[PDB]
């Protein structure tokens, strides 16, 4: 509900170093492909960060309703971006409870 | 072994098939049937039904 | 033996590092791709180098 947006502009970006930074399986993308992401030039890119449960990662898709997608983080129907998701149990969980 | 699931080892074994261009050398365990002639019949010649 | 991030690269039409410098599948590929995790056999605390 209080997710942060960071503006990225006026730089060159290499997208082959993403896989060495976070332990995710693969990209999921809408409108583009991750293989050809380094073959063209953009205007502006933004980054969003939040943490949700494993049952609500399906609500980070366009045209989907639910709990997170209806009241916390709604995506456009013409979304042309790529969403990365990975598991983090050693940093986002505590034996006493990460509240 | 303490790494994440994205950096975990994977053992990949892929199979490449070759379509029927030669005499077939690998086929399944089905028993053959004796040939019939001059009758309306269903056939199966190395996987080619009809 | 490949990394877990390179499983999707073993396909026809894929580009990257493994698909362009180690192992490339043809566009007319007709086969089955099998991948399974091997964290017990191919991992060492000192590293499987």
Strand, coil or helix: A86? strand
- Within an 8 Å CB–CB cutoff, is residue C43 touching chain B? yes
Strand, coil or helix: C44? coil
What are the angstrom distances between the C-alpha of B26 and each of A78, B13, B22?
Answer: 50, 19, 11
Strand, coil or helix: C37? strand
Find out whether A57 and A85 touch, Cβ atoms under 8 Å: yes
Q: After which residues does a break in chain B occur, C–N more than 2.5 Å? A: none
Question: What technique was this entry resolved by?
Answer: cryo-EM
In terms of Cα–Cα distance, which of B30, B15, B17 is closest to B47?
B30
> The sheet that has B9-16: what strands, in order across it?
C2-3, B9-16, C31-37
Find out whether C36 and C49 touch, Cβ atoms under 8 Å: no
Task: Pick from B2, B5, B8, B10 the residue to mutate for testing the C interface (most C CBs within 10 Å).
Answer: B10
Give me the count of residues in chain C. 49
Per residue, the 3-state secondary structure of B1-50, as one string, reads CCCCCCCCEEEEEEEECCCCCCCCCCCCCCCCCCCCCCCCCCCEECCEEC
Provide the resolution (angstroms): 3.9
Which residues lie closer than 8 Å to A15 by C-beta, 6 or more apart?
A34, A37, A38
- Interchain contact, B5 vs A19, CB within 8 Å: no
Strands (E), A1-99: 4-8, 28-29, 45-49, 82-83
Q: Which residue of A has its CA nearest to C16?
A: A35
Distance between CA C8 and CA C6 in Å, rounded? 6
Where residue C26 falls (left for φ over 0; alpha for ψ -120 to 50; beta otherwise) is beta
CA angle A20, A38, A46 (to 5 degrees): 75
In terms of Cα–Cα distance, which of A89, A7, A98, A92 is closest to A48?
A7
């Amino acid at each position: 509900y209080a997710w942060n947006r960071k503006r990225i502009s006026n730089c060159v970006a290499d997208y082959s170093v993403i896989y060495n930074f976070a332990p995710f399986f693969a990209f999921k993308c809408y409108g583009v492909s991750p293989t050809k992401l380094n073959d063209l030039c953009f205007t502006n890119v933004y980054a969003d960060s939040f943490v949700i449960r494993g049952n609500e990662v399906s609500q980070i898709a366009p045209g989907q309703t639910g709990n997170i997608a209806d009241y916390n983080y709604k995506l456009p129907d013409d979304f042309t971006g790529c969403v990365i998701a990975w598991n983090s149990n050693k940093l986002d969980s505590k034996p006493s409870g990460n509240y | 072994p303490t790494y994440g699931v994205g950096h975990q080892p994977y053992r990949v074994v892929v199979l490449s098939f070759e379509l029927l261009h030669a005499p077939a050398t690998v086929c399944g365990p089905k028993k053959s049937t004796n040939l019939v002639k001059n009758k309306c019949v269903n056939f199966n010649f190395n996987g080619l039904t009809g």
